[PDB]
Amino acid sequence: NAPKRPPSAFFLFCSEYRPKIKGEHPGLSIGDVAKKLGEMWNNTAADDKQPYEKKAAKLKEKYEKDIAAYRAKGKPDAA
């Protein structure tokens, strides 16, 4: 029922690095270490974006369609 926004390229990255920066930053929050990632991703390894992208992309892509397909109907239910 009603799909819920999968990863965003940066989401993969976020997960992978949180505990590394946090690793040395056991004083930050998932609001600051998050801000760090928030930026590092832009200015990450541009060739590392590629894998992250193909994954988040595939998942969100499905979503937008199945969502569009779960909205198109429900109420008019006459095509």
Swiss-Prot record:
PTM section of the record: Phosphorylated at serine residues. Phosphorylation in both NLS regions is required for cytoplasmic translocation followed by secretion.
Residues with Cysteine sulfonic acid (-SO3H) modification: C14
Modified residue annotations for Phosphoserine: S8
DNA-binding region: 3-71
Location of the protein in the cell: Nucleus; Chromosome; Cytoplasm; Secreted
Region listing for Binding to AGER/RAGE, in residue ranges: 58-79
Region of interest: Cytokine-stimulating activity: 1-16
Entry domain remark: HMG box 2 mediates pro-inflammatory cytokine-stimulating activity and binding to TLR4. However, not involved in mediating immunogenic activity in the context of apoptosis-induced immune tolerance. The acidic C-terminal domain forms a flexible structure which can reversibly interact intramolecularily with the HMG boxes and modulate binding to DNA and other proteins.
Family membership noted in the UniProt record: Belongs to the HMGB family.
The protein's role, per its UniProt record: Multifunctional redox sensitive protein with various roles in different cellular compartments. In the nucleus is one of the major chromatin-associated non-histone proteins and acts as a DNA chaperone involved in replication, transcription, chromatin remodeling, V(D)J recombination, DNA repair and genome stability. Proposed to be an universal biosensor for nucleic acids. Promotes host inflammatory response to sterile and infectious signals and is involved in the coordination and integration of innate and adaptive immune responses. Nuclear functions are attributed to fully reduced HGMB1. Associates with chromatin and binds DNA with a preference to non-canonical DNA structures such as single-stranded DNA, DNA-containing cruciforms or bent structures, supercoiled DNA and ZDNA. Can bent DNA and enhance DNA flexibility by looping thus providing a mechanism to promote activities on various gene promoters by enhancing transcription factor binding and/or bringing distant regulatory sequences into close proximity.
Subunit structure and binding partners: Interacts (fully reduced HMGB1) with CXCL12; probably in a 1:2 ratio involving two molecules of CXCL12, each interacting with one HMG box of HMGB1; inhibited by glycyrrhizin. Associates with the TLR4:LY96 receptor complex. Component of the RAG complex composed of core components RAG1 and RAG2, and associated component HMGB1 or HMGB2. Interacts (in cytoplasm upon starvation) with BECN1; inhibits the interaction of BECN1 and BCL2 leading to promotion of autophagy. Interacts with KPNA1; involved in nuclear import. Interacts with SREBF1, TLR2, TLR4, TLR9, PTPRZ1, APEX1, FEN1, POLB, TERT.
Name by which UniProt lists this protein: High mobility group protein B1
Positions spanned in the full protein: 58 to 136 of 180
